[PDB]
Amino acid sequence: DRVRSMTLGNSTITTQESANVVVGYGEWPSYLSDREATAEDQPTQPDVATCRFYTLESVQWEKTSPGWWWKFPEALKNMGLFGQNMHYHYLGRAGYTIHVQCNASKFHQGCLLVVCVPEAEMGCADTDTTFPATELTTPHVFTSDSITGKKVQAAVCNAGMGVGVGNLTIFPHQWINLRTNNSATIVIPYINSVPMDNMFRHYNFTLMIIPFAPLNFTDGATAYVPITVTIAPMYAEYNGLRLASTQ
Amino acid sequence: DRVRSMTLGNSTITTQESANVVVGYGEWPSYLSDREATAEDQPTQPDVATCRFYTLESVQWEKTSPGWWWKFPEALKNMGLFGQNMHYHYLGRAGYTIHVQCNASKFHQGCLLVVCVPEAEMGCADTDTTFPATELTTPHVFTSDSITGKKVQAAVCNAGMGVGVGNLTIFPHQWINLRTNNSATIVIPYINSVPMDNMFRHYNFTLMIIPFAPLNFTDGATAYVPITVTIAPMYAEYNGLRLASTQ
Amino acid sequence: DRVRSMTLGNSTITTQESANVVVGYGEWPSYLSDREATAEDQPTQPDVATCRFYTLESVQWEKTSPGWWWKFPEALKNMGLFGQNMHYHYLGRAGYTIHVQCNASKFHQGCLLVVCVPEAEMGCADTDTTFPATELTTPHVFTSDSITGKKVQAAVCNAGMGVGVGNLTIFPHQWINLRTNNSATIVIPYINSVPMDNMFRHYNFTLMIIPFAPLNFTDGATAYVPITVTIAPMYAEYNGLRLASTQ
Amino acid sequence: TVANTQPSGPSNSTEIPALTAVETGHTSQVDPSDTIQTRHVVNFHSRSESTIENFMGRAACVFMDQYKINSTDRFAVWTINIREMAQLRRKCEMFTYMRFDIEMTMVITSCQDQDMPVLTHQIMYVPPGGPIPAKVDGYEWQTSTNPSVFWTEGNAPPRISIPFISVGNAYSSFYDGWSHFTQDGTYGYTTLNAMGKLYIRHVNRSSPHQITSTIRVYFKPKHIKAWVPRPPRLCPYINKRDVNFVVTEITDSRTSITDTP
Amino acid sequence: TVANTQPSGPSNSTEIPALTAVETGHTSQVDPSDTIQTRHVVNFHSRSESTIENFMGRAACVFMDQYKINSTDRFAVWTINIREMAQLRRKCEMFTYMRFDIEMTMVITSCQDQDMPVLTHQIMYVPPGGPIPAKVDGYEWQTSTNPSVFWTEGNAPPRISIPFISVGNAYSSFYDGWSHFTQDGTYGYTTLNAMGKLYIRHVNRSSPHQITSTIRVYFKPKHIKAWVPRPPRLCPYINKRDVNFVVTEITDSRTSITDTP
Amino acid sequence: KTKSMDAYQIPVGTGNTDKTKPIFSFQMDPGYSSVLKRTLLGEMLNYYAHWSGSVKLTFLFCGSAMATGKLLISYSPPGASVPTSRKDAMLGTHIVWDIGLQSSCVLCVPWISQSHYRMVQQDPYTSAGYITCWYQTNIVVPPGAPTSCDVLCFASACNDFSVRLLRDTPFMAQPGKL
Amino acid sequence: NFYKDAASSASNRQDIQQDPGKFTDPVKDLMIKTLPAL
Amino acid sequence: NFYKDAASSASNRQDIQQDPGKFTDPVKDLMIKTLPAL
């Protein structure tokens, strides 16, 4: 039960050392029902053009790297037809199979926390101002210090949202322990207070990858150990066609 | 039976003086069946995002205007999500409700031929060379003369394909007689020798609008009489996802 | 369903381009029942002498004419036997078929609002005084300005009763659009807080005719376009015989 | 609840739901299911709070006046009408005829301009034609058949219920008519407003210092029936005994017909 | 009640309850019956007081402000939010989405900075977009359709119930998103907080001396449904319109990893 | 033009200039929009804080019987800017309205919202789209008919329309004793 | 009901009735949504 | 219940429900306590 495969919309994912997929809060994503819907317009359901695996830019994991975060759905804009249906539609749902994968040898050690946090409302570096939208969204890095300026407070102990970073285990999450597994798959149903929401101005969840045990290896092992994020929306549907937004 | 309405994917069309819609060759378009298909991949069927009315640029109809032609599907590129699914997919079908509309008073006269010709393979102006692709595709105009150069032979008597222009009545067509109707709706099923075909390098049909009786009116009537083309694909489905083509 | 005829008490009304008659609030008028009555005296019911079409003085509709209003039942005094039964009786009901008719060519344009407003309590031109009864009741004209003096405030935007004139559509009303119809028929049941009321000191409703789109025509068309009001009470009954009142 | 939205598909037929004629006095009954393609959605939305009982059924201030303790400024008089204050007037001048019975709630707050003992107030209602008091020791105040409320301060506000006391089958917000039969005298709804005066005083005989009490009457209509709706008032409320107005713009202006924020 | 402990004995087998893998996102479901030898004990302990209705169902202070009698300091305004005070904020910022309807209780205590007669207070709530008063004789105060509470001192505190008045299917404690569609303007939960202002004043017209009243609003959530739990707040609450923070130690320190008291 | 009758009528002409320019354009939210805050839909909506359902816009053409035309009335949900061309406006929920004997058309704004209700007041979180009108072809008129016509607009609610949270209206604005 | 008088009673807020047919379509000749108006 | 409105009611403190399976073990493949994790 360590080997697993995920095939979505002409893109399959192979893993051979992995924990089983974690279904966020025990709910598998699905289309919006007729009783819980709010928009009387026929939604667009391109199941194979958008609901497929998209591979983000990989990041180098070093001995002193604090962590990273992505903000979805927005991070998936201008990527395939999933980003084109954002610009032409006003509403959207998805279910985001998140496949974070980081391989190593049996002579490397380290432990990542791959956690999906719904509504990770970040905090500004200077407590009396507001920071631009380019700060939130090459994933932004945490820092093992305290930054100052018109930035998101990207310290690691307070994970950006101002909590204990060890208490991020309450969210749907996995661990990549390099002796056990080299990938972590999290399935996230559509979590929001509203049945459909705009995908640009609203970040439904953020993906935080935080090494609790840092990477360590002796001389001779490969120093370049990259972390690759492969996110695939599921059961994505759109509503409210209009002219394309320039963003 | 003169009033009619067409509602496709959040876009309706109202006409009050019209002939009934003409179904091309008596076949209404539909999705590709399982026995006549050729590509074993799940096709994308965005029925409401692409199968809707798109309104092209209107053209001025004058006393001496020879005619116009559009080349579809290609003319519908970079227009809505129907053009975005062209750039990301390799194959495509549609069924193209074509609604050509040209209104006038009861003191204007004239008669247009709105004809859809499958595979209108044009002819070069100089008989020994080949002309660029910008010549084929502001719709190109015919000329009531003989042009010369690296161009499509856009004379009107030979409608570009080298036949008698009065013999274009064999194709699915209507007439806009300004005393009877002010619109012409033609439904075109997917006509090709192949079940799916690429939408960029291949022009499944061209829309020729040719005034047989020219526009005429005395002084005081409105001189600006525009012709508007409102084409809506139907049962469009796509196959072969890939990176976006730059065209 | 455009031709219609109305025959009341030896007087018929012919129209050939008209909307269907509008029944005020969905109630057709009738005689007062035995359970909703208040006066134990045998009422006078002259069904053919009073319940018939009476034609008021026609008014000229110009390019800059603001509008008109009549006040009924009072406007129908000293007109036939319907006005004689007012002077001898103390109480009265009716049901007022209102047939406003304004014909034009197919080269005239304009749009009237024929609205019946129950209890159109007007407003004085100077806000601190009261105006005589000859101001309320050749129909009084609105003005496209602001008048001052001991008069009813006959501006058009505030229709005299101090509301938005576009919001007079809540009342039973029709439109005379000169391209569609040349008449507007409104049936008004007896609307009052009381089963019978005196017809002189109390104006049950007023008939406001307001051109939203003004009259327009080129040179050569007939400039004199009159608006004629043909009001016919229905199910009129009277109570309280006495000597004739001198008004 | 409100009507659900039925699912529709692509249509090409000789039927035309969008095509209407406004000049028929007819409002089109079309839904978004007739114009575009819709999904099936179940509307659990209700129209429970737009009803006339929920709309009008909130206590609105209708009268404020002062009356002092320790002359004619010693007590208050109102000659009941809705037209004293603008916000409830615009709700009642929205229907031509309306039939309701109201309960009134008084908020009586005494303020010093030496210590007040305790203040007890009397709100006496005389129906129309009754004897009016011209003094606090009037003799009218004894209420043999007039309804009256005695209230001492520091308690709950005095709420009593009133029936539908109109002569007609409904109250009339508007009366386009005259008072006399010769079309003379008072014009408008003032003629119909025959509801008695309301007299409020301190039943305390006197006070060592000048105490000024103010009363706030709050009508809340209930068991409400309204007929013949009319548009809401646009221009303000210059008078109380007549619908007189200065002409005002119908709507806020823009710079162009295309201009939009 | 909570689960009883089943009796176990000495075990020597190829099954391993203690051996787990945390990297599966899985919390082990083992009991002390799996690791050691246990006796049978019947647990009559219940989890009745750890539920969300019992945890959140206590009235917490959410607003304090002064308003004086006898300008704009004559009345108070709150523009309702939970974020005014830290203790109830940390309970509500513990769940991402939560759906509840609340009753509010006011504690109004007037204090003198010559004798106050009696003080009657008005707590008027305007839903968002309504007319705001800029003065005590505003004209806004008459509450034709605004809810309002009139309270005279010396009585029980004014408690009224409020429904779930949010536009969305739940209140959102956190909104990781922007106000405008171009990702611009206001960031955070402020965009979603559209609940009307709360206006409190003395309905007493004036006073012979300066009296300063203070109001204390106590929300108590009831009929509570909470979704998506999140960790409690570590660092303090610098702002009210944003979750901004100074970085703080995660836990109190020790001198050594072995060091223990 | 507000304190007059010309506020209601929409100028629609026959010409060669400005046929790639909108005829009108305004906010779709009937509470704060400076066009339809005063309608009967907007007067009864301003007593409430929340509103749900579809509104529909009816367009009466008040030209001559010989003048014919076609118009494109479009609704585009928020998220992008106002449509500046007819190409960008025909991507929203539009209707091409042929002008003939019927002479009236209904654009039903289909209630495409994220939430179940919207705020009557203007806030970014719940803002309605844009209603623009364009020339589909033109207005064509005979030699003797008047060449300048005008469209008259209407607005009402559908059967699934509801208002939700009672409040006071801001319009009355009493200054003092009457 | 703790009082005999009917005016001394609670407001009947619960009932929800409506007849919009007497305002939106008060016309005599029935007008079908599908059919043309004239 | 002395009021018609549902928000004007007592807090339903009595009910005690819980589903800790959606937080402690949200995994797809069932994991037995007895068996090894992988």
Ligand SMILES: CCCCCCCCCCCCCCCC(=O)O
């Ligand atoms: C202490 C006894 C108090 C009794 C007070 C009686 C109040 C009379 C009823 C109120 C009049 C309502 C008139 C409404 C007319 C309208 O709607 O225009």
Ligand SMILES: CCCCCCCCCCCCCCCC(=O)O
């Ligand atoms: C006198 C009338 C008083 C009415 C007061 C209405 C109070 C509005 C409801 C409270 C808002 C609750 C918002 C919670 C949002 C969150 O949990 O973050």
Ligand SMILES: Nc1nc2[nH]cnc2c(=O)[nH]1
């Ligand atoms: N493939 C799959 N479909 C589901 N539908 C509901 N739950 C599931 C699941 O766990 N897996």
Ligand SMILES: Nc1nc2[nH]cnc2c(=O)[nH]1
């Ligand atoms: N709507 C419609 N569907 C079809 N399916 C096959 N033929 C037809 C047709 O003519 N009209």
Ligand SMILES: Nc1nc2[nH]cnc2c(=O)[nH]1
């Ligand atoms: N002629 C006629 N009599 C009625 N009696 C009740 N309704 C009607 C009606 O609509 N027409």
